[PDB]
Amino acid sequence: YTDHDRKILQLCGELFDLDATSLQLKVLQYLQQETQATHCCLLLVSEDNLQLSCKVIGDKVLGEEVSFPLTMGRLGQVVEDKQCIQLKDLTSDDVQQLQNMLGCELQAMLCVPVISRATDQVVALACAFNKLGGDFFTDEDEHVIQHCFHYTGTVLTSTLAFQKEQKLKCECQALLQVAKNLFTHLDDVSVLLQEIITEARNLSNAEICSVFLLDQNELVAKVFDGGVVDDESYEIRIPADQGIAGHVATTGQILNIPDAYAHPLFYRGVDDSTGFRTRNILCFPIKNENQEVIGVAELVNKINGPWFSKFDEDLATAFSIYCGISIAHSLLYKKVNEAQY
Ligand SMILES: Nc1nc2c(ncn2[C@@H]2O[C@@H]3COP(=O)(O)O[C@H]3[C@H]2O)c(=O)[nH]1
Numbered sequence: 607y608t609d610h611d612r613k614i615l616q617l618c619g620e621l622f623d624l625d626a627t628s629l630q631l632k633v634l635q636y637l638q639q640e641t642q643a644t645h646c647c648l649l650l651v652s653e654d655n656l657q658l659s660c661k662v663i664g665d666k667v668l669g670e671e672v673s674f675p676l677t678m679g680r681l682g683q684v685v686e687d688k689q690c691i692q693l694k695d696l697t698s699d700d701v702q703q704l705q706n707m708l709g710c711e712l713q714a715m716l717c718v719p720v721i722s723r724a725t726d727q728v729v730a731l732a733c734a735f736n737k738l739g740g741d742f743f744t745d746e747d748e749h750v751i752q753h754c755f756h757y758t759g760t761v762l763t764s765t766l767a768f769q770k771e772q773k774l775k776c777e778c779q780a781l782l783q784v785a786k787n788l789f790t791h792l793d794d795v796s797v798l799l800q801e802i803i804t805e806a807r808n809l810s811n812a813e814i815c816s817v818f819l820l821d822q823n824e825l826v827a828k829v830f831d832g833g834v835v836d837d838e839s840y841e842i843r844i845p846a847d848q849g850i851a852g853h854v855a856t857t858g859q860i861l862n863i864p865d866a867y868a869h870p871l872f873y874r875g876v877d878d879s880t881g882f883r884t885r886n887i888l889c890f891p892i893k894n895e896n897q898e899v900i901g902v903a904e905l906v907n908k909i910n911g912p913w914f915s916k917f918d919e920d921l922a923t924a925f926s927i928y929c930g931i932s933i934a935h936s937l938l939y940k941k942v943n944e945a946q947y
Pocket residue numbers: 814815816829830831832844848849850851852871872873874875876877880882884887904906
């Protein structure tokens with residue numbers, strides 16, 4: 607009736623939410639008035655046409671969505687036959703189920719199937735329970751429900767389909783992300799760069815070693831404490847002109863500091879952050895084929911010594927070159943391998 611034609615348009619204008627659950631609570635509550643039912647709910651038909659699911663009952667959003675086979679009772683037949691039914695028609699099991707969900711005595715019921723105008727299939731079963739007034743839902747109630755979804759259904763089907771597809775998509779992209787990571791980490795420069803400076807660390811007898819690749823006015827610790835950081839989360843970045851690291855990144859010349867603390871250029875920040883203390887620092891640059899500093903590296907703290915020797919200083923030179931020569935043979939072999947293929 608135009609009485610309900612106006613009430614609907616208002617419901618429609620009020621179905622602006624992007625979440626299917628919220629769009630249901632509003633439609634459900636509309637019906638609980640126009641039918642005088644205590645609790646309403648939509649039993650959504652799955653894709654495989656094998657189950658019924660429910661997420662919202664009345665104004666209560668079930669913490670977990672409930673689902674059960676269409677086999678499991680008389681309701682599944684409504685999906686096939688497209689004819690409403692009532693309490694008197696439900697199997698004992700149906701009542702038991704709907705009651706486990708509703709959490710109360712099931713005194714009255716009307717179940718109108720919702721038919722897609724697009725596919726003409728039963729998309730869901732709209733249910734009215736326990737009428738406060740009568741004990742049987744009218745014939746007028748079957749029409750108001752039916753009426754509502756003629757205008758209301760599509761937006762609910764879309765908002766729900768949208769969220770299903772989105773959740774599916776993410777789950778998939780995520781799994782793809784796992785895989786991508788597992789393979790794009792192979793040609794990571796920080797992997798050989800790491801084992802190289804780990805060699806230097808041994809030969810020079812330092813406690814730790816770290817490599818800092820320059821990132822446009824911000825040195826990034828790709829290798830730190832001997833291991834490949836492996837995450838920009840607990841990263842380690844710094845201004846490309848500060849400290850000894852930055853001073854080498856700027857002069858491109860090896861620096862051997864016997865006492866970090868007592869040096870004008872030493873940056874204590876990293877230490878009082880990590881809670882580690884830097885005694886000596888033997889920092890060498892890592893240049894590209896353009897002979898330009900692309901990153902810097904350092905051997906930290908001499909073991910069984912007051913500082914890094916002249917010999918150690920030589921390793922720094924040799925490893926500075928070997929470092930660049932290795933990034934090279936790697937750039938060339940990366941191509942003369944992916945091209946061959
Ligand atoms: N804990 C830790 N500190 C490091 C490592 N490498 C360099 N540093 C410290 O971080 C500092 C940043 O630049 P500094 O000139 O202050 O010199 C560096 C060291 O004190 C490393 O592998 N581990």
